[PDB]
């Protein structure tokens, strides 16, 4: 659907809150901390200070407030008090908050302690794949072209793109049309129009693209157990580009990307 200026302003607020959760949690992502504790810190912040709510809790039965994925875990990892972070771990914390009826969905990678060269490389390339997609967003561009560009870049940099999960429209609904694939698919044919709001969240594997879903129905891992990284931003298509609604202080791209002169 096409969001009204009123809807978009509410999404700016929700997106900002989701981003602030990631900015807040940063210092706590240290060796020795449990993902369960990280989840509590995030949830307490969302509820007690932001006065919002996690869109994750109860969603299709999801048991926690945020998703925390480590190393070979591709996405939707479930916070656990017994899972401790250690040196070299690459960790994704995926936050989705609902505020004033609208969603803000975003995630970023954190590297614990001493980084490993490939771990840093994978995260760097993954974020750049997201940035490349973001710089392409504007009315007239087809989602298929965006997916194709992400895949071309990721593969050109020696990595692979997960196919089973994708970006998505977002608003009063957590996941709305359309699907935002991060690869070139013949199924995709959506011409972007101003007012559309959706996420871009490429999952990149250091090894092969194949994944495997654990018994809990949420935790997804790389089939070859290679590392997997992901970054996600919620955006709104503007008349001449896009506006990132979940930008953080550490992002190295501006919130508004216009293609004018
Ligand atoms: C509990 C569901 C988590 C959904 C993720 N935020 P995404 O939509 O980025 O995959
Ligand atoms: Mn997310
Ligand atoms: Mn999402
Ligand atoms: Na991972």
Which ligand ends up closest to the CA of 221? 4
CA-to-CA separations, 184 to 27, 146, 166, 242, in angstroms, rounded: 37, 8, 12, 21
Ligand 1 binding pocket (C-beta < 6 A) is 56, 59, 62, 67, 75-76, 94, 96, 105, 165, 201, 232
DSSP string, 74-126: EE-PPP-TT-B--TT-EEEEEEEEEETTEEEEEEEEEE-SSPPHHHHHHHHHH
Sheet holding 167-169, edge to edge: 176-180, 167-169, 197-200, 233-238, 241-244, 256-258
CA 238/CA 28 separation, integer angstroms: 35
CA 257/CA 77 separation, integer angstroms: 32
CA-to-CA separations, 195 to 4, 18, 241, in angstroms, rounded: 7, 20, 11
CB neighbour class for 14 (10 Å; exposed up to 12, middle 13-18, buried from 19): buried
Phi, psi for residue 42 in degrees, rounded to 5 = -65, -50
Counting from 1 in the atom list of ligand 1, the atom nearest the Cα of 175 is 8
Residues in a beta bridge with 234: 199
**Is residue 234 within 8 Å of residue 79, measured between CB atoms?**
no
Architecture of domain 1-261: Alpha-Beta Complex (3.90)
Final resolution, Å? 1.7
All residues at 6 or more sequence positions from 31 whose CB lies less than 8 Å from its CB, including other chains? 84, 85, 86, 87, 112, 113
Q: Best mutation site among 67, 165, 175, 178 for ligand 1, i.e. most ligand atoms within 8 A of its Cβ?
A: 67
Distance from the Cα of residue 28 to its chain's centroid: 19
CA-to-CA separations, 189 to 144, 145, 197, in angstroms, rounded: 6, 9, 16
Tell me, in angstroms, the distance from the centre of ligand 1 to residue 258's CA.
Answer: 28
Phi, psi for residue 248 in degrees, rounded to 5 = -120, 165
CA 63/CA 191 separation, integer angstroms: 36
Q: Checking phi first, is residue 241 left (phi over 0); if not, alpha (psi -120 to 50) or beta?
A: left
């Amino acid at each position: 659907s096409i969001k009204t200026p009123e809807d978009i302003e509410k999404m700016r607020v929700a997106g900002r809150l989701a981003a602030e959760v990631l900015e807040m949690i940063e210092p706590y992502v240290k060796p020795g901390v449990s993902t369960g504790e990280l989840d509590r810190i995030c949830n307490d912040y969302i509820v007690n200070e932001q006065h919002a709510v996690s869109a994750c809790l109860g969603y299709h039965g999801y048991p926690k407030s945020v998703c925390i994925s480590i190393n070979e875990v591709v996405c939707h990892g479930i916070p656990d008090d017994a899972k401790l972070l250690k040196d070299g771990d690459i960790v994704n914390i995926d936050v989705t908050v609902i505020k004033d009826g609208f969603h803000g969905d975003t995630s970023k990678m954190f590297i614990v302690g001493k980084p490993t060269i490939m771990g840093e490389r994978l995260c760097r390339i993954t974020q750049e794949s997201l940035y490349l997609a973001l710089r392409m967003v504007k009315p007239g561009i087809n989602l298929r072209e965006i997916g194709a560009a992400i895949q071309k870049f990721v593969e050109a940099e020696g990595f692979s793109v997960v196919r089973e999960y994708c970006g998505h429209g977002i608003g009063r609904g957590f996941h709305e049309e359309p699907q935002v694939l991060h690869y070139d698919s013949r199924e995709t044919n959506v011409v972007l129009k101003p007012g559309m709001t959706f996420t871009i969240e490429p999952m990149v594997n250091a090894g092969k693209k194949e994944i495997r879903t654990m018994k809990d129905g949420w935790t997804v891992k790389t089939k070859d157990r290679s590392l997997s990284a992901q970054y996600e931003h919620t955006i709104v298509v503007t008349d001449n580009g896009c506006e990132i609604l979940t930008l953080r202080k550490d992002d190295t791209i501006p919130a508004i990307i216009s293609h004018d002169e």
